Paper text:
IsdB is part of the S. aureus iron-regulated surface determinant (Isd) system, which plays an important role in the acquisition of iron from the human host. IsdB removes heme from hemoglobin and transports it to downstream Isd proteins, where heme is transported into the cell and degraded so that iron is released for use in fundamental cellular processes. IsdB binds hemoglobin and heme using widely conserved NEAr iron transport (NEAT) domains. One class of IGHV1-69-encoded mAbs blocks S. aureus heme acquisition by binding to the heme-binding site of NEAT2, while two additional classes reduce the bacterial burden in vivo by an alternative Fc receptor-mediated mechanism.
Efforts to crystallize NEAT2 in complex with STAU-399 or STAU-229 were unsuccessful. For STAU-229, we found that the NEAT2 peptide MTDLQDTKY (residues 342 to 350) showed reduced deuterium incorporation in the presence of Fab. We projected this epitope onto the surface of NEAT2 and designated this region antigenic site 3. The interaction of STAU-299 with antigenic site 3 shows recognition of Isd-NEAT2 near α-helix 3, using STAU-299 CDR-H3 as the predominant interacting loop. Because STAU-229 is encoded by the IGHV1-69-2*01 allele, this mAb has a different inferred germ line gene sequence than that of STAU-399. The residues in positions 52 to 54, encoding the key amino acid motif PIF that was conserved in all of the IGHV1-69*01-encoded antibodies, are changed to PED. The I53E and F54D alternate residues encoded by the IGHV1-69-2*01 gene make this germ line-encoded CDR-H2 loop more polar and hydrophilic than that encoded by IGHV1-69*01. Similar to the studies that we describe here, repertoire studies with human antibody responses to the influenza virus hemagglutinin stem region show both canonical CDR-H2-mediated IGHV1-69*01 allele (F54 residue)-encoded interactions and noncanonical IGHV1-69*09 allele (non-F54)-encoded interactions mediated by CDR-H3 (38). It was interesting that the STAU-229 mAb described here is encoded by IGHV1-69-2*01, which lacks the F residue needed for heme-binding-site recognition, and indeed, this mAb recognizes an alternate antigenic site. Conversely, when STAU-229 and STAU-399 were incubated with IsdB and associated with hemoglobin, we did not detect a difference in the binding signal compared to those for IsdB and hemoglobin binding alone. STAU-229 significantly reduced the burden in the kidneys.
Numbering used by the authors:
A (entry chain H): 1 to 143, 153 to 199, 208 to 228
B (entry chain L): 3 to 212
Write the structure that this text describes.
Amino acid sequence: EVQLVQSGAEVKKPGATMKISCKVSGYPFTDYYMHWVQQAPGKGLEWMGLIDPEDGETNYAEKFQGRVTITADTSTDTVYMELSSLRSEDTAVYFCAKPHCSSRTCQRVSGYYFGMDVWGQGTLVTVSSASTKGPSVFPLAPSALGCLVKDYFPEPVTVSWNSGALTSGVHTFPAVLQSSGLYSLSSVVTQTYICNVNHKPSNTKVDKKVE
Amino acid sequence: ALTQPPSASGSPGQSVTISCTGSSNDVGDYNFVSWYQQHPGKPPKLMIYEVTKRPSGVPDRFFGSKSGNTASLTVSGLQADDEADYYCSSYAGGNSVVFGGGTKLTVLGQPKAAPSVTLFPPSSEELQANKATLVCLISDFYPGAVTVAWKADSSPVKAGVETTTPSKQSNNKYAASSYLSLTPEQWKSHRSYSCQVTHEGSTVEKTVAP
């Protein structure tokens, strides 16, 4: 019954500030602390700190000291985490986590000792100096068929084939992050083949028929 | 702050033990060590608390222990879905929660599979924009690690090379991508270009030419 609902994905310029939310249901809000954990892409779990919603007292990990602010709102059962002066090194998934109660009365459940048993889905945050740009779409043909989706930002991109009528033998590859800050991906198919490339952030839709 | 081996591995029905080495200030002097299991794209799931206790719903196969400054997690009767990242965590003197680096556990069900390589030349369209991109598509390999090397004629090129990480496919094999950026002039000056994909010692190659 306990659900932790985090706010949606964020894309942020360096030097900006983010503030993400963790909405809480299934238990008495002020009886449990609330923790925040950072996870860089392909890296480990790193503790950010906690807040006790009963008294609003916080404790931040030394690594984020001065940049982070955790606040709680008992009227909406929501915990917020704000991270200041962002850089790309802060590109990561950010979880909220409710302390696990192993005691007989579950009051002032700090989470220092018995771990955290319920986590929010995570909030993905991308920090890049790049700005929004739609893709160019080029055919891929031998001398197996597909489209090259070049130099877009940010994620994501949707690629279908023949308005979704073509589902068999289609392989869309995860994009590469160029050192230019832009992404490029390829989607391949193994009588007419048309790309339907969708990049909602830039409001670009490209239909590309490949020989 | 807590030290775990980067990776561990075990066959179905066999067993594996994951070490978590810390300090006396955390794992040594406190029985507050947690273990978390994390499947891809999912939030961690608490598996052990207080060194050896298991939350409701965690099978007995996950067995926690510690000796001095080093805590361990053993998993027995390995199944496929035990494959995940496992993190230890502990209380640390001074009111802090400290984590380990995590261990990627692999369960060895799937046979080793060589990558299928497809190399695409630059499009005439792109050449008109005075750019040229060679696309090397790598699919259906297991385990999920390759190295990629490009060649102009017989000469290796590493400038302009961009390679993705391995990503699990829907069929539980892995995929990856590598892009070679060139000028139109470089593309036309060579007899051919080739993308060489090495997988568990064995290399698969594809070639294209102007």
